[PDB]
Amino acid sequence: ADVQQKLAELERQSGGRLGVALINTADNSQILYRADERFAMCXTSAVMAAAAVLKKSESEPNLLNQRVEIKKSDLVNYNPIAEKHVNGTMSLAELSAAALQYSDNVAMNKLIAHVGGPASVTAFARQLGDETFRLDRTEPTLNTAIPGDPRDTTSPRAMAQTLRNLTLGKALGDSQRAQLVTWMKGNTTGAASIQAGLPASWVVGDKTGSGGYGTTNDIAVIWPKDRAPLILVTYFTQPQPKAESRRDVLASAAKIVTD
Ligand SMILES: [Cl-]
C-alpha cells in the first residue's frame, strides 16, 4: 500500500503517466502500477528484435558473424555506431550490440529487417507466449509515442514477464541467453534511468527508450547484492508533444519499488 501511494505521488508530481512492473524472483512476487495499460515501447523494443536474431541463430551457426552493408541510405535520426561504418559492413553481432548498448537506430533497423520486419518480431513475441507486445513500425517512426495510439506498444506486466523469460528463463539457448545478458549489462544509455535509483553495488542489464511526448522508458534485469534477481519495467509518457526527457522519474520509480 505504501509503495502504491509513493508511485501515485511520483506520477502526480511528474505530470505524466507512469507504468511499472517489478518481478522479484526471490519470492515470485510483483509490484504493479498501470501494469495492464499500454505504453509506447520506443527503443526498448530492441530487446525483442535482438532476441529474435539470437533465436534465429540457434538454427544457423555463424548467423551472428553474417556481414551487413551499411550505406548512407540506411542512416536514420540517431546512428552513433553505424555512422562510423558507412560503406563497409558490420556483423549481426555488432549490430545487436550497437542497438542494445548505444540505441543505434540503423542497428535496430538491420535486426528488424533481418528477421522479416516488425510483423516477424511480433510473431516471435507471440511464439514466446507474449500476446501483448506489438512492433508495428521501423526506426525512427516507432518512437512517435502519440497518446491513444496502440502502435509499437506493450504493457509493463507483459514486458516484465517477457524480459524475465529472455534473460532468466528459457526462451533462448544458454549461449544466446548469456549473449543477451552480456549485451544488456554493457549498455551505455541507462545510467540516469533505473540504475540511478538503485545502490551502486547492484548489477544491471537494461535497455532504454525515448520518443515523442517526452516518453522515457527503461527495462532491466537486476542482480542486487546477495539476492535473487529482479526484473523491472518503468515506462513514462507525458501530455505535451515536445515534453523533455524525464529519466529521473524512472530512477525514482526504481528506488520506490526496491527500497
Ligand atoms: Cl549506493
Residue numbers in the entry: 28 to 286
What do the authors report?
A cocrystal structure of enmetazobactam with CTX-M-15 with a Lys73Ala mutation indicates that epimerization can occur without cross-link formation and positions the Ser70 Cβ closer to Lys73, likely facilitating formation of the Ser70-Lys73 cross-link. To clarify whether Ser70 epimerization results from cross-link formation, we obtained X-ray diffraction data (0.95-Å resolution) from 3-day-old cocrystals of enmetazobactam with a CTX-M-15 Lys73Ala mutant (CTX-M-15K73A). These data reveal l-Ser70 to have undergone epimerization to d-Ser70. Comparison with the uncomplexed CTX-M-15K73A structure (which at a 0.95-Å resolution clearly contains l-Ser70) shows that this is due to enmetazobactam exposure rather than mutation of Lys73 to Ala. Epimerization leads to the d-Ser70 side chain oxygen interacting with Glu166 and Asn170, which causes loss of the catalytic water molecule. These data show that epimerization is not dependent on cross-link formation but, rather, is a result of breakdown of the PAS-derived acylenzyme that occurs prior to formation of the Ser70-Lys73 cross-link.
It is predominantly plasmid mediated, disseminated worldwide, and encountered in diverse Gram-negative pathogens, mostly Enterobacterales, but occasionally also in nonfermenters. CTX-M-15, like other class A SBLs, employs an acylation-deacylation mechanism to hydrolyze β-lactam antibiotics, utilizing four invariant residues: Ser70, Lys73, Ser130, and Glu166. In this study, ultrahigh-resolution X-ray crystal structures and mass spectrometry revealed the mechanism of PAS inhibition of CTX-M-15, an extended-spectrum β-lactamase (ESBL) globally disseminated among Enterobacterales.
